[PDB]
């Protein structure tokens, strides 16, 4: 279940933050598990129940008077600001970073993983407030791509002098 440098993010791509790796999706697909992206539904109703509607969220039926259909987080997650975060990360603030689960402490622990250029600060409750360094360890094998710091995360992007084509995602 761990996302490693060898993981293939299906219909997606890997990104790295100061203390972990995660999968992001191509176009407007959504994560259904940590390594799989799928086409999202635009409306929840009877015929799309249990279909992906967002990252780690699916359409569910809400019984009542009237019956409704909503997009609710998968098991293990809670909706905070309309985003599915792990239960153990409920109301955890990391500053320049995000809360994640620690498969180094395999006991269900919420830790802070920080934007590239920041590291956890032991003086600030392990928040992402200490300027710091992270080594990119992404492979980036697709031709004319290398690891780059984009928007505070490491990802495979087009070599210097090259521009990504929007329609195909090919570096030209």
């Amino acid at each position, epitope marked *: 279940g761990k996302v490693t440098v060898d993981t*293939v993010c299906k219909r997606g791509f890997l990104i790295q933050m100061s203390g972990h790796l995660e999968c992001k999706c191509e176009n407007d697909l959504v994560l259904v598990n940590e390594e799989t992206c799928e086409e999202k539904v635009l409306k929840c109703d009877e015929k799309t129940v249990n279909k992906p509607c967002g990252d780690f969220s699916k359409c569910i039926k809400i019984d009542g008077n009237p019956v409704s259909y909503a997009c609710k987080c998968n098991l293990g997650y809670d909706m905070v600001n309309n985003v599915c975060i792990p239960n153990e990360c409920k109301q955890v603030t990391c500053g320049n970073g995000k809360c994640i689960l620690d498969t180094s402490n395999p006991v269900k622990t919420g830790v802070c993983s920080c934007n590239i250029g920041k590291v956890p600060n032991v003086q600030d409750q392990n928040k992402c407030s200490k300027d710091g360094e992270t080594k990119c360890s992404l492979k980036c094998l697709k031709e004319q791509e290398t690891c780059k710091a984009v928007d505070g995360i490491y990802k495979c992007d087009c070599k210097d002098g090259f521009i990504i084509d929007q329609e195909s995602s090919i570096c030209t």
Partner: single-chain antibody
Amino acid sequence: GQVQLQESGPGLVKPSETLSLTCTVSGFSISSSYYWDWIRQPPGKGLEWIGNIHHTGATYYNPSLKSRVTISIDTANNQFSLRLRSVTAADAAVYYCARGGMGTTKRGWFDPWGQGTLVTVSSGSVLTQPPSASGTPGQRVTISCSGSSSNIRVNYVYWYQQIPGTAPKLLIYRNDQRPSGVPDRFSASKSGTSASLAISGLRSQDEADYYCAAWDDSLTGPVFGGGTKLTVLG
């Protein structure tokens, strides 16, 4: 570049064999943000989507075929293949490969299409369209496409024209928009769960099969209409 697709396959398979097909993509890297789709057409029926693969290995299959179908991709040689097991006479058809778009704005968009390979077998639709339409030169004809809340209402509709002997070709994209080269006498629209294709100024060059298509969120994949065979009289 000049993306082109070409199918290779057996011409004849025996019942219970596994049909094997291969699509070669040229002028373009298969390691791109697209789906690589297999679609088939029984010799006198409509289009049926079989499945697709992404270069990361993720596959989508038609549920009705899931138990018998495997699609694989070979990025080093820019190829992708179809395996269909326990072939029966019902599997005889023209098989096409195509490049399908990803995401809400492009899913259901197939361009370019392969020429198609005929598969014969030896011995031993979700969207509804009128089966046929007819008119005389100069008239306007309309072709209906009735769907549901899971495909037409929430997903973009696409129209494809198949001149006899040729592969389907994109005629209309994103409900009402014309690809360069299709004249404006071709129009299309969508309302609720239904869609319509209007052809003005009918001429003999229009005689062809017309198919609507849209991604279905219930089945998780593209669905085609049964097709309308437009005949021009005189």
